[PDB]
């Protein structure tokens, strides 16, 4: 059926996405990239924990779906159903080829898609409250068991799935430089229209 | 493998720069070119007449012939193991002058005026140029304050 992943572990073939030129590609196994309670606002889930690669290699969509499933199951039976939100941060855009079951006319045909990950690159992220940190770490370790390379579990210095740090977060919210909307936040720079400042700051 | 078409591989070099399309500016047409001067060959792609080959794009030659809209240029091209002077007819939207030779001519005139003033005033002055000498021993004032102590930072993993 599917070859062992060690045949396609390494990035050596010059990114190959599905386009005009690459037609007839099957669907990747990972279809859901976000999971859990995706509507908690910004401050329901302040703690973010990433699982980040430390190797230059490509991971298969099958491995991504397996890790997403097992991390989701541990988070569900540990932190409750609506106690977390996870996003995988890696989409399988690179198409891998297979040659048919001599070497004449040997250019293969699309059999799958993988995601190429770099050395410093987040593979998965979970945001949760500040008291489930060990549960996030355990879920990410048990999901780390589904990949070929070497991965590290790291708690971010930033508030949830944002790009602003947890110490300067509430101060920016209070001085209204950072307005919450949805899962994330908008940054308000002090160079727009003053009428925008007036419909804000009031 | 590949074709021997005349514009093979010229997807980007014969294109226009970003937000630079449309009408060709008229100063490029109203430059003058006397036979003997040094011109750069670039070859824009808005004009399709008289355009140079991709081997001559980005090159530099001298004018040997002037016609109504074009110029005959003598360019050095490197065929496999020899350099030979090719004679190409290229249009004035595709060429422009050479500031290198311009700079050389103005330092020639500066040298001539300097030698004239030295001869009339009775001195000896330097005319050549010298390649960036070493660095002439000097004192560095601390202005009373002590130099700041630098120190490598600890390792923290952000990204």
């Amino acid at each position: 059926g599917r070859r062992p992943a060690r045949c396609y572990r390494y990035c050596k073939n010059k990114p190959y996405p599905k386009s005009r030129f690459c037609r007839g590609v099957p669907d990747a196994k990972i279809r859901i990239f976000d999971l859990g309670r995706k509507k908690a606002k910004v401050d329901e889930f302040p703690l973010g924990g990433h699982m980040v690669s430390d190797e230059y290699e490509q991971l298969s969509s099958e491995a991504l779906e397996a890790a997403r499933i097992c991390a989701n199951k541990y988070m569900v039976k540990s932190c409750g159903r609506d106690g977390f939100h996870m996003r995988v941060r890696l989409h399988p855009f690179h198409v891998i080829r297979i040659n048919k079951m001599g070497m004449r006319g040997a250019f293969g045909k699309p059999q799958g898609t993988v995601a190429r990950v770099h050395i410093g690159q987040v593979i998965m992220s979970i945001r949760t409250k500040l008291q489930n940190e060990e549960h996030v770490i355990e879920a990410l370790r048990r999901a780390k068991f589904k990949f070929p390379g070497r991965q590290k579990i790291h708690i971010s210095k930033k508030w949830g799935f944002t790009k602003f740090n947890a110490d300067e977060f509430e101060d920016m919210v209070a001085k209204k430089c950072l307005i919450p909307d949805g899962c994330g936040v908008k940054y308000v720079p002090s160079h727009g229209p003053l009428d925008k400042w007036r419909v804000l700051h009031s | 493998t590949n074709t021997k078409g005349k514009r093979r591989g010229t997807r980007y070099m014969f294109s226009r720069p970003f937000r630079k399309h449309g009408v060709v500016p008229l100063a490029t047409y109203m430059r003058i070119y006397k036979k003997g001067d040094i011109v750069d060959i670039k070859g824009m792609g808005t004009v399709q007449k008289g355009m140079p080959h991709k081997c001559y794009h980005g090159k530099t030659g001298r004018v040997y012939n002037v016609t109504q809209h074009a110029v005959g240029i003598v360019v050095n091209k490197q065929v496999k193991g020899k350099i030979l002077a090719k004679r190409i007819n290229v249009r004035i939207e595709h060429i422009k002058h050479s500031k290198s030779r311009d700079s050389f001519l103005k330092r020639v005139k500066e040298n001539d005026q300097k030698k004239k003033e030295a001869k009339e005033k009775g001195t000896w002055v330097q005319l050549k140029r010298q390649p960036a000498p070493p660095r002439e021993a000097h004192f560095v004032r601390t202005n009373g304050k002590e130099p700041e102590l630098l120190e490598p930072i600890p390792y923290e993993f952000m990204a």
Partner: protein, 293 residues
């Protein structure tokens, strides 16, 4: 809040503006490229074009050649400088274009010193004339015609100015097809109605027709003819005296007026500290207003 906006951030990010005089609507760079640029094996010969522009109240005739820093006007005539002899009213019409072109030609070649030869046609008949270069004497001035965005049809005042310059003595290549005497259906040039258009006899006929038909609409149309009392008679002779005065003394001279003050008629551009203080006190006044509540 339903339709996708078109002039958005990416629209202005990759918008490329046209040339300044194109997006002001004054220069056709197609015709400009074909008309200004000299052959490269001439190397420095200026290429002269006679710009003719008819505004709402004035006719401008210039003679220029292009340099890299911008064009160079050599001579310029004006319908507003026409009334210092002969005519006083009835500018920006075909007869005014003829005398303007004549004045520009005579001014240019008496600047160049070739007035004692190249007399053109000292009497006006609206027929085909082209100057020729007398051997041993300097060659005739060669100019082309810059009509700009003016739609060239039969009976355009740009061709009035062309006929004026050619009778003045310039050599401008042309044909009599776009002259008001030209008949389209017979491909024939009459030249007597062209002479009438040069003398302004069509406006005189309009004046006579309006007088015998009416009084109040006639003076409402030609109000500034009643002032200076330009009857439909003495219109052609008047233009003949205008032509004679141009041939007599075509040199331009201006007047000095230098006793002027330095008053600002615009507003100065505001400064950075002014703008910062403006937005500061605007915020302060807003917060003060919302605490008055």
């Amino acid at each position: 809040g339903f339709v996708k906006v078109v002039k958005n951030k990416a629209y202005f990010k990759r918008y490329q503006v046209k040339f300044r005089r194109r997006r002001e609507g004054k220069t056709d760079y197609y015709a400009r490229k074909r008309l200004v640029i000299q052959d490269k094996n001439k190397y420095n010969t200026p290429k002269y074009r006679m710009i003719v522009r008819v505004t709402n109240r004035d006719i401008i005739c210039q003679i220029a050649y292009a340099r890299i820093e911008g064009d160079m006007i050599v001579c310029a005539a004006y319908a507003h400088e026409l009334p210092k002899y002969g005519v006083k009213v009835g500018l920006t019409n075909y007869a005014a274009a003829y005398c303007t072109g004549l004045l520009l030609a005579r001014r240019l070649l008496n600047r160049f010193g070739m007035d004692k030869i190249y007399e053109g046609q000292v009497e006006v008949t609206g027929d085909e004339y082209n100057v020729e270069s007398i051997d041993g004497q300097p060659g005739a001035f060669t100019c082309y015609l810059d009509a700009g965005l003016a739609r060239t049809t039969t009976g355009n005042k740009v061709f009035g100015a062309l006929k004026g310059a050619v009778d003045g003595g310039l050599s401008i290549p042309h044909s009599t097809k776009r002259f008001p005497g030209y008949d389209s259906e017979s491909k024939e040039f009459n030249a007597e109605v062209h002479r009438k258009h040069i003398m302004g006899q069509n406006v005189a006929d309009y004046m006579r027709y309006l007088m015998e038909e009416d009084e109040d609409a006639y003076k409402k149309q030609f109000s500034q003819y009643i002032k200076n009392s330009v009857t439909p008679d003495m219109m052609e002779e008047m233009y003949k005296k205008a032509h004679a005065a141009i041939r007599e003394n075509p040199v331009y001279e201006k007047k000095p007026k230098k006793e002027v003050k330095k008053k600002r008629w615009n507003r100065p551009k505001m400064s950075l500290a002014q703008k910062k203080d403006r937005v500061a006190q605007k915020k302060a006044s807003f917060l003060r207003a919302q605490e008055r509540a």
